[PDB]
Design a protein around this ligand. Sequence first.
Ligand code: CL
Ligand code: CL
Ligand code: ZN
Ligand code: ZN
Ligand code: ZN
Ligand code: ZN
Lengths: 196, 196, 197, 197
Amino acid sequence: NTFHYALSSNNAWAGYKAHQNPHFFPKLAGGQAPEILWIGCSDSRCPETTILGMQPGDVFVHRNIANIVSPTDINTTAVIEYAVAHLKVKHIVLCGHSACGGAAGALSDGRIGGVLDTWLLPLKTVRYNHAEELDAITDEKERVIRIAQLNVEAGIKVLMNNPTIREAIAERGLEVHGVFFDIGCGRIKELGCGTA
Amino acid sequence: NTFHYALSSNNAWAGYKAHQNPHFFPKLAGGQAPEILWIGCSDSRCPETTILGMQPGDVFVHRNIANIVSPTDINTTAVIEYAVAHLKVKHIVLCGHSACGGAAGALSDGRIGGVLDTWLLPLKTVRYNHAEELDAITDEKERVIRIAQLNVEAGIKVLMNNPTIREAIAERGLEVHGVFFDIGCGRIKELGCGTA
Amino acid sequence: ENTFHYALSSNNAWAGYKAHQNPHFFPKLAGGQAPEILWIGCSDSRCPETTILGMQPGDVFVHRNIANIVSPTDINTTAVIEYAVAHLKVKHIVLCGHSACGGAAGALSDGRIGGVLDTWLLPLKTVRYNHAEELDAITDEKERVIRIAQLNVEAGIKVLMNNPTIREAIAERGLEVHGVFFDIGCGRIKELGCGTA
Amino acid sequence: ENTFHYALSSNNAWAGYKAHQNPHFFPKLAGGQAPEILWIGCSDSRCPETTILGMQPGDVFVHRNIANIVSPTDINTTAVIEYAVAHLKVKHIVLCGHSACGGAAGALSDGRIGGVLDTWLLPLKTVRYNHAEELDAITDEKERVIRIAQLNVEAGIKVLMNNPTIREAIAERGLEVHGVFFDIGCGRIKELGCGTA
Ligand SMILES: [Cl-]
Ligand SMILES: [Cl-]
Ligand SMILES: [Zn+2]
Ligand SMILES: [Zn+2]
Ligand SMILES: [Zn+2]
Ligand SMILES: [Zn+2]
């Protein structure tokens, strides 16, 4: 039902866009030259290209549960290697957000079940290493926001230790940014962690 | 530079949206109820929410190199488990597309280097098992398109063998769809593989 | 802590004995390694490659996981394979399945094993689905588990044979790949007839 | 194929010998397993857990990878841990690092090792970066490799101690976790003083 609506809406968007610019799709099929790799949360409220007000073809993206960057995870590392070594993107944006379900999960003391407890483990590690600080926050939603920000900082550290990324910094001046999307106001701010 | 422009454009989009609907962001921060899990390629030309002409909050998404669904990959499986067992999405859309870089990579005979040769291995396996058919296509771009379609079919098979997914089919009537986004015309079509 | 401390004690005893037998055994061990076999097997306590092959420390390079599963995108296994084939230049890759495999039995049952295990065993569950007719027709439970474990070895061999490092090393060095089966009841290892030749 | 066929031959000889020593050894082995130790170690050919601990097939459940690295999201290792702790109810988890570790040395060099290996070794490279002062001050290369391998054991222990299954099993069953180091030169295993107690 909603799937068939999504198909209808795709055809509508494509038709309107094809009238707007008869050369838009033919140039799009020609290739891509995105300048940003976006790594974010799978959350439905975080479509990178919409919330940044940009166009198809300029944001190369990876999205997972709680925007977690893990050192040995091959899924994410493939996206990073292709983006940095092949597409030569100039910016890497690791984005956390408010009301993150994975963050909230890591703050909980229960088994979420299945694969998720293992996937969220580096966030739980972030929980344990800042437990003093997180527990001191009386407001639950601000606690979820805080652990999401700390998760961004950690993910940035991992990114700054990625060899493909550091080669690109050293030779091309690749930039890395940790940002936070606040859904309540719809704004994205810098957390102050990254290349400079 | 383009990063700072992306921030400006985010603030602009947020401002305009906040005038359009003063309750949009406050309800967004309230929670999510997406009805679709979208699994697609990291390609910058494939932002799911734009090409489907939808809004932030209704498409839960995972994106990787060449939209590959691997049986033991925990990154993807976390997104699937959270989407199906916790968000209770009603549709899963595995989307391949034309001019896929990973597909083209799998069609090549060279080492792409780093982690990518290992990540694309299930696509290379698709290459080998349909080598007769793929080699018979004289046009390179149509060969890339074909292997991308076959990759979608394979990923669907894996999805249909995921336990979390099949439980949801058996008890909730979860639907699974394999689709293909043709960048040249901007349209998404069904490949005819999935639940029904 | 008792059994662990016993393990340390037995280590010290084994080291004392090995060192009296050959005073140059350990210094030569510490010099480097030149194993000729990469062993990929099940984590099963009953399957220690170096003991059952009656060989010595320094000649078998090994990776072991649940139900000896070789997955295409698994970075853990691929690292061991890459290091073994491209750095140590091993001449043989042995994928060894075995009888009474718990992971195999888990794949044959229809209940949730829980945690991460259903996902790890998913490619074995996939082998289950594609041979359901053959597997279900087997009246003996132990022979059904043995059979699904052997089919698992065959599948893993196919994956290894599609690995780029392995495939190149076959093409230029004559790297060999073998699918074998360790039958615990008789303690013997047989070839399954799948691999390089 | 010679060395592989020799391995099959030696297996048959070992099985013949083990079967004459104890005619009930193999049938009892085939009945099931009750290992009390989960061993996590390096794939290194010089580190076969069951030999160096001087124990028998059926009492050590093992996972082995490059440089014995325990990564939080690695599903391969987590499967072995889950099966060992929640199904077999092992009482001890032994993370064993060793001397002359190739992965350790790889992490200490600054060149690309190539393929998947830089990514797998990334958490060891991370340990390198955080202890660069200590590691660089070591004049002896072999003691630098040993040191980074020990720090790697310590880090892996921290990860194991944050694992939910391990943590629960500690809380209710008194599961124990030990960080150890196998020094190949003398063939002895020592405790690093990191773990449950
Ligand atoms: Cl053959
Ligand atoms: Cl202690
Ligand atoms: Zn989130
Ligand atoms: Zn693509
Ligand atoms: Zn087994
Ligand atoms: Zn080692």
